[PDB]
Amino acid sequence: VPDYQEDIHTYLREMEVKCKPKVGYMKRQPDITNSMRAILVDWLVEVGEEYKLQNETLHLAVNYIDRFLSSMSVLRGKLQLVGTAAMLLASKFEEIYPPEVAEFVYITDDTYSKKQVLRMEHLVLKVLAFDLAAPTVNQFLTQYFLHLQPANCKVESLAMFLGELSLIDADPYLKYLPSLIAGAAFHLALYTVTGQSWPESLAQQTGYTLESLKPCLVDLHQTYLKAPQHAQQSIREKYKHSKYHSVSLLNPPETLS
Amino acid sequence: MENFQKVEKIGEGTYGVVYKARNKLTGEVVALKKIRLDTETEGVPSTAIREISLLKELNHPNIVKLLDVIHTENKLYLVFEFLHQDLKKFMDASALTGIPLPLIKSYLFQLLQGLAFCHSHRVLHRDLKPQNLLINTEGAIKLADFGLARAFGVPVRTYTHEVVTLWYRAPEILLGCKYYSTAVDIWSLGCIFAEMVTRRALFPGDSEIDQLFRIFRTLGTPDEVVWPGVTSMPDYKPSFPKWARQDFSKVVPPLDEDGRSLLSQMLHYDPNKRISAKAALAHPFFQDVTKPVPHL
Ligand SMILES: Nc1ncnc2c1ncn2[C@@H]1O[C@H](COP(=O)(O)OP(=O)(O)O)[C@@H](O)[C@H]1O
Ligand SMILES: [Cl-]
Ligand SMILES: [Mg+2]
Ligand SMILES: [Mg+2]
């Protein structure tokens, strides 16, 4: 849809600021930590694979979770309930065939009941005020991909991988906007696979120069290098698959431009 | 729900009912859309989640205003501004006299403005038909019923196959394309445009194949020249009868050259060539557009 492409990008750039979670919210949570959040999201990755859900669904769920936690205190025993309801809501929004609630209950091994998950769905909806149509790193990536002609599926797989890795670590990635994370991921993926750099056409469209990506790019590069050592491994396992060109097996570049 | 007086039932569905109602405290007349959750073992229906979340972003003169959402254990209420009637009821009342051309042009122009706003905010409507379009006494018309709407990606991916009401359903959907986008909404508006002009549904099929053939008999059976890739569509059959395209002077008699031009562009077979809402608004057909009052 080239006639609206520009308008849509502009709109998403406005929305990502409005749907942005509070960068330092974890300091104000009395019981949960970044490490527990990482474990939750890693688990959501597996859930998504189990039910063959879209990557977009995963990204939305994370957005919902971080926004919910930005205003609601949650004890560690209930964090997964928040996560499950978030994934359920993201599924209903994004999927053609969302799994039924009984399946979400099953996937938690009966940690929570149907009533609990449905009641949590209501609370999340109330807290987010039904504002579910959030822009994700995923949405910006797919737009950025259009600047590759012809398309490079390996670069796309790697960009998605890198973008997904950013969901795990609130520190530091909560401080960058999805559009910016998507730019660093795209550049890094392109550079790794083809040795090329972030396109002038993308610099103009997004207003991000290669230097403006630098801060996020440095973080993303480190994350990439240390990925095999990270405590959470569900994303690497996922992207070893041939459908993703086994990009998680590719060696990251030692240094950058 | 204490503060609302139900005045009459104006709609009904499998998920609930639509009432005309008045706020007992302020006097405001509203449309009340009631959605049952008790018959919902799945919690809040995805259709409602999409309708609410997408409407809240869509602030435009030609899109129905969502005023409030009341969410309880057993029920979900959507509160809308109240409009006089939908375009179907109006068309039925005008079936003998006809809708004056200046009014048809105004409505199409307004619908295109609402639709272009949707598409510019990455929303597909997917259920454009006269009964989902609302008119007031002052000459305005607005898109409504976003229950089938969806936020889309750039580029798009495969979305739900079973969407638009048969009569208004685009051929790329009928032929089972893996991908469809904004062009399906333009097709629907094209059908509605012709419907206003001729006082009857352009393509009133009674099955998917019948729907396809009615389109083919009017616009001609598509081939690889008119529509590259068509013979590779999942539900295309090389055995389809080959009909010739009819002259629009026969299809939409009352319509001038510009009208016929715009209509044909809205009904282009190839989704990639089909006119966009934005471009449609710049069509010479609208150079003289006014905002006449309807006759109720
Ligand atoms: N805001 C409104 N003002 C006036 N009538 C309305 C309004 N909303 C709905 N209606 C009437 O109720 C009918 C059904 O409403 P709609 O939103 O289309 O629900 P459904 O999803 O069941 O079709 C419409 O065809 C219209 O005639
Ligand atoms: Cl109708
Ligand atoms: Mg309707
Ligand atoms: Mg509906």
Coordinates of C-alpha atoms in Angstrom, one line a residue, chain A residues 1 3-5 7-8 11-12 15 54 56 89 92-97 101 114 118-119 121-122 125 129-133 139 142-143 146, chain B residues 41-44 46 49-50 52-54 56-57 71-73 116 119-122 150-152 154-155 157-160 181-182 276-278:
Chain A
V1 CA 0.0 0.0 0.0
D3 CA -0.3 5.4 -1.2
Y4 CA -0.6 5.3 2.6
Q5 CA 2.9 3.9 3.5
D7 CA 1.1 8.4 6.4
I8 CA 1.2 5.1 8.3
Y11 CA 1.2 7.8 12.5
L12 CA 3.1 4.9 14.0
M15 CA 1.7 6.3 18.5
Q54 CA 2.8 -14.6 15.0
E56 CA 3.7 -9.6 16.1
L89 CA -5.4 -10.4 24.6
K92 CA -7.4 -12.0 20.2
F93 CA -6.2 -8.7 18.7
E94 CA -3.7 -10.1 16.2
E95 CA -4.4 -13.7 15.3
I96 CA -6.9 -15.2 12.9
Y97 CA -7.2 -18.2 15.3
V101 CA -8.6 -19.6 27.2
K114 CA -10.0 -20.0 33.9
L118 CA -10.6 -14.1 32.4
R119 CA -10.7 -11.8 35.4
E121 CA -8.1 -10.1 31.0
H122 CA -10.7 -7.7 32.3
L125 CA -8.2 -4.2 29.5
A129 CA -8.2 1.3 28.6
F130 CA -8.6 -0.9 25.5
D131 CA -5.7 0.8 23.8
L132 CA -4.3 -2.4 22.3
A133 CA -3.2 -1.3 18.8
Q139 CA 5.9 -3.3 12.5
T142 CA 8.6 -5.0 8.0
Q143 CA 8.4 -1.4 6.7
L146 CA 10.8 -2.7 1.8
Chain B
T41 CA -16.6 -18.8 27.8
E42 CA -13.7 -17.1 25.9
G43 CA -14.1 -13.8 27.8
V44 CA -14.2 -10.6 25.8
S46 CA -12.0 -10.5 19.7
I49 CA -11.6 -5.9 21.4
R50 CA -10.8 -4.8 17.8
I52 CA -13.2 -0.7 20.6
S53 CA -9.4 -0.3 20.3
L54 CA -9.6 0.8 16.7
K56 CA -10.7 5.0 20.0
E57 CA -8.0 6.0 17.6
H71 CA -17.4 -3.2 30.9
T72 CA -19.0 -5.4 33.5
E73 CA -18.8 -9.1 34.4
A116 CA -8.8 7.4 3.6
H119 CA -6.3 3.5 5.7
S120 CA -3.9 6.3 6.7
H121 CA -4.1 5.0 10.3
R122 CA -3.5 1.4 9.1
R150 CA -8.4 -4.9 11.6
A151 CA -5.1 -3.1 12.0
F152 CA -2.8 -3.9 9.1
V154 CA 3.2 -2.7 5.9
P155 CA 3.5 -4.8 4.0
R157 CA 0.3 -10.5 5.6
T158 CA -2.5 -13.1 5.3
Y159 CA -5.6 -12.0 7.2
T160 CA -9.0 -13.6 7.7
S181 CA -5.4 -5.0 1.6
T182 CA -7.1 -1.5 1.4
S276 CA -7.0 4.4 -3.5
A277 CA -9.3 6.5 -1.3
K278 CA -6.8 9.4 -1.4

